[PDB]
Amino acid sequence: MISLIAALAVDRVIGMPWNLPADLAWFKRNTLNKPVIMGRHTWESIGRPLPGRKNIILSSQPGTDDRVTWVKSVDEAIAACGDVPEIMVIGGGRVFEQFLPKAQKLYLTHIDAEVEGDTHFPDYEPDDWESVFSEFHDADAQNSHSYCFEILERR
Ligand SMILES: NC(=O)c1ccc[n+]([C@@H]2O[C@H](COP(=O)([O-])OP(=O)(O)OC[C@H]3O[C@@H](n4cnc5c(N)ncnc54)[C@H](OP(=O)(O)O)[C@@H]3O)[C@@H](O)[C@H]2O)c1
Ligand SMILES: [Ca+2]
């Protein structure tokens, strides 16, 4: 099954005006040993394959890096994962919009930061997604903002 994972600021802004090592531990635990699907802009932003994971990059043009697996469509990305329990889509905004209708699980980090960004998470509605887990953490000496881990399953 497909799951989206992302860190959302106010107004669902994504993509780094914060410094959250605790969110990176949450991201690493939830994606480790699972294939990750990302768009090309996300891929160039990270700049390196996420270790311990099959990296699948969506792009309409031929691949330019043999360290990862390149695909040209959503169906081809899903097929490139094979038979795995859970597929993790990690961004960006354009890729999230295509995978939201097919996802059954949302891993969200709600960051209490006002950021004027030009990329947003899709507008998921409460009647389609039911919160099954929530965990707030205050801002501390290592995390620049307060944040809230949430897991939503399709109701
Ligand atoms: N390093 C960077 O380039 C970079 C990093 C961060 C942000 N930005 C900017 O910030 C904005 C954020 O964009 P984003 O986060 O929404 O990007 P994204 O989802 O991470 O990547 C979108 C790209 O993925 C490819 N793609 C997505 N779906 C596809 C499909 N079904 N079939 C084939 N290819 C597909 C396309 O690349 P192709 O163009 O190859 O088709 C598309 O341009 C972008 O407008 C960008 O200009 C750029
Ligand atoms: Ca709806």
Number of domains in the chain: 1
Cα gap 131→114, rounded to integer Å: 23
CA R_g for the chain: 15
Q: How far apart are the first and last CA of the chain?
A: 15
Any idea how long the chain is? 155
The experimental method, as deposited, was X-ray
In angstroms, how far is CA 136 from the centroid of its own chain? 19
- Atom of ligand 1 lying closest to residue 61 CA: 40
Q: Among all ligands shown, which has an atom nearest to the Cα of 61?
A: 1
In angstroms, how far is CA 134 from the centroid of its own chain? 17
In angstroms, how far is CA 91 from the centroid of its own chain? 5
Cα gap 89→86, rounded to integer Å: 10
Q: What is the CATH number of the domain that holds 138?
A: 3.40.430.10
Containing structural domain, residue 21:
2-154
Answer whether 53 contacts ligand 1 (Cβ < 6 A).
Answer: no
Answer whether 73 contacts ligand 1 (Cβ < 6 A).
Answer: yes
Cα gap 75→149, rounded to integer Å: 29
CA nearest neighbour of 7 among 155, 144, 127: 144
